[model samples]
Target: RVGQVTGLAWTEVGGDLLTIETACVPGKGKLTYTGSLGEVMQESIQAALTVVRARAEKLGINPDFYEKRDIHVHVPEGATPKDGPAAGIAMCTALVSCLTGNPVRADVAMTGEITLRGQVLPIGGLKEKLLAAHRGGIKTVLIPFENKRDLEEIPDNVIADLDIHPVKRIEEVLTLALQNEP
Candidate 1:
């Protein structure tokens, strides 16, 4: 009953704009990210949407968030390309962020695969990921709870300045990401 060539509406959503510096609308269920996202990554986006579609209510989002709004996920550094599967957790954040008009914590960064069941799956090279996040000025990070064991891979000093969170479910990521939202 969504987007069936019928008229579109955002009855209780999609009117607010809350961006820290980069301007965009939120609560509209629109996601926009820019980057060279890979094919698998694009499909991953499809999967992320699929999962959200299935669990919107459970996730505490208006089911109409997907049914009524046009959520656009844009990853910057776009060669007009869809980067990679690494977008799962980040894209999920972007989707949630766009839907809530909640600006992501500037100090936090994350990358992990979020299963349709809402579990956060592990990723590789967390140490390298953590390093890049730190150099980029991130003070908090989100990684797969299953990958907490991987934390040992990051140097103590490299992680000393950041507050790390290992999440087991996508909902947790939503919370960590939205803790500063509404």
Candidate 2:
């Protein structure tokens, strides 16, 4: 049975928010990667795992939990060849969601490349990414702080329903998505 769910998108510009799902497996730790993942996207997942593991202590998360379980990351459209570093944050978000067993709120969407230091680097295709989220019915879009200029171009109607959050770090994205506890 799946415990959590989130969405991911791989576009002509780059990868978008990817949905990560987790469930209990009777045995065997498996990582089933679907969707049209390129070598870079696949590597991003591995990189994300490393960062998450390294930061487990600071994040107050149990590192052992990740080791005992399996992970599956599917990109949705397995036919398209997708590649980019922009997915680093999405991959990390999926990992966090799976580990925490927290369902990503339906209103939230995000994009950025995460570093081992937990830094969220800027990504491309801000307008396109926001548009994708809007079309998907997302009400809040998290983007890199540097992309603030792109928000100005967003139509007011879109901005009216959607909350555009410009984030500089991974924690900010988490706070917005997870709804920081006071």
Candidate 3:
């Protein structure tokens, strides 16, 4: 549970729930990912790790935590191809949870592109992603703050069914998605 987080995504079929899992084992600072991720998504993982490394101290994680532990970021449903930058915030949350001994809340899900500076950028398919979250029974959803305007396009019933947070920073995500007592 320490290194798991739910992410929402906009796929061709519609929006769907994305699961991110991380594990740390004793080894050199090697990072690997599985689940048929594409080039953009793979780059997204790199960006996510860098963001965590930059704020490691402030986040109460060791600055060189990766030095002693080989980090593996995995996504389930390996048979299905998944790709995009939208899972950035979720990946960051997973890495942080893995390194900080925190457990991500099971009821929370997020979608956004995270920048090197930790800013959460707007993503597409807000309506579909929110719908997927609603259908999946996720109680809370985190989206880019800039995507707030897109809510107007979502059905009123769908919008009212979940606690949706429009976030502009990764810190806000960590606060809302991570449990306090680990």
Candidate 4:
């Protein structure tokens, strides 16, 4: 899939996997989000798109993508409620992946709040998310650079089991997560 990425999410019970999906079609500019997203999460998607649009030229995506294509963002499991800005980087990755025709690596999972400037902001529950990522069999994890301090609280075995990268920007995430040559 050109536009799909895994995100780590925190739940009341623990952490879980969140899949962000995007599809771009030739049509009037319209960004649609599905999977019963919450207000915060929906707003995060808008911010994520803006972040991508800001780097359009550098990333090789058309600046007029909004006018030339209809973008649909979806999170699987419509029945389960999914919310939060922690998936911002993942959302941005999927959008960039879709617009650039690059496929995201299947073994990568990420969690971070994205700013309009493309900065990857820290999020909570890093320990649980790392645990979930490990349990999900993800080989690599992209976490907010500021969240690095939280790693000390996570079990050594779990930390040793996965390849984790502290990302300060969305570009770092895309570089590590998206497969080359589409």
Candidate 5:
């Protein structure tokens, strides 16, 4: 969403060839979400946003960033609305990447819920998400550290294509997702 809205070459997320495109304009302090979104998904975005705001300082972002900016997170295909905490890390990665002006690894994708304190909490339907990413040609995937045990459920072929990384906190997400920031 950011790449398309900002007109960059890479605008695909797990290949968003035709999904929701998110756009955000930063202000001093405000948040306005648009498009069709359900309760759980919306709440997760808020949680992820808060996590980013709280860790802004350490992440080289303003700690008062959200208070000083208006962030917008939009979901695609409003008619077929979807909501869940599973998208927390994906949206959070986008938001943080946007804030830092660093691109997220194009071949990688992420799942897992984010906490206000920056933990990457385990989420449900782990294999389903992995399958989706695999089909999408995503080379790497990040899941919560707690979800590592469920990796057994993923088939060998699917697991073989993925450079799976089990993460514990949002800090790790930034480290893995953002390009060459170290």
Candidate 6:
């Protein structure tokens, strides 16, 4: 049985469930990339890491968390060339979830591009992405704040069963995804 669900979206790859793996290393803060990532995607990850590192103190994250561990991000089906800014938030969400030992809520999924300044930029394919989340058994979706307007275009049935949350920051996204957390 699936314990938790996290959604990932890419311009070229649409939406998918991100696979996360974590472990402790004696010393290292490196992030390894697999699955044929483009320069933009790789840079996005670096930017995200920078933001997370900068906020470590404020967020109560360990200052040496990165130094004592390494992160490896992989998107399955590496054979397909994938590129996009949409997966940015998903990547960061996955990292935060793993780093905190927090399981992504089974009912929540997210899509957006994250910046080094921790801004969540809008993404395209709102309807398609939402559909993917619904099909994947997600009941709530976290989207870029700018995309909230797109909710009106969604069918009534879709809106009835799903809760759509549009957020401008990573903090908001985290709150929406892990609202029940103590």
- Which pairs of residues collide in model 3? none
Candidate 4 local lDDT, 1-182, one digit each (tens): 34889998643344678888899988899989998788888998999999888899999887987897888999877767777789889999899898988888999999999999989999988887888898889999999999989999999999889999999988788899989742
Worst 10 residues of 6 by lDDT: 17-26
Residue runs of model 2 more than 4 Å from their true location after superposition: 1-9, 12-18, 22-32, 179-182
Candidate 6 global lDDT: 0.69
Q: Write the per-residue lDDT of candidate 5 for residues 131-163, one digit (tens) a residue.
A: 777777778888889998999999999999889
Candidate 2 backbone collisions, by pair: 6-19, 7-18, 7-19, 8-17, 8-18, 8-19, 9-16
Ranking by lDDT: 3, 4, 6, 5, 2, 1
Stretches off by above 4 angstroms in model 3 are none
Superposed model 5: Cα runs more than 4 Å off: 1-22, 26-28
What is the overall TM-score of model 4 with all chains considered together? 0.95
lDDT tens per residue, model 6, 1-182: 11123655653556454443333345487768766767777777677667777877766679788877777776656775566677777677666666666667767788888988888998877888787777777788888999888888877788788888888998887667653341
CA displacement after TM-score superposition, residue 150 of candidate 2 (Å): 2.1
lDDT of 2 by residue, 1-182 (tens): 35333433465555455564434344455666666777777777778777778876656677665556676766655566777767777677666665665556677777777788878877766766777777788887777788787778877878887787778887776667763320
lDDT against true structure, model 5: 0.68
How much does each candidate deviate from the true structure in C-alpha RMSD?
A: 10.2, 3.0, 1.6, 1.6, 5.2, 3.2
Q: How does candidate 2 score on lDDT?
A: 0.67
Q: Tell me the lDDT of candidate 4.
A: 0.87
Q: Give the TM-score of candidate 2.
A: 0.81
lDDT scores in order: 0.58, 0.67, 0.88, 0.87, 0.68, 0.69
TM-score of each: 0.74, 0.81, 0.95, 0.95, 0.83, 0.84
Per-residue accuracy of model 3 over 68-165 as CA lDDT, tens digit each = 88889888788777888999999999999988888889999999999999999999888888888998999999999999999999999988888989
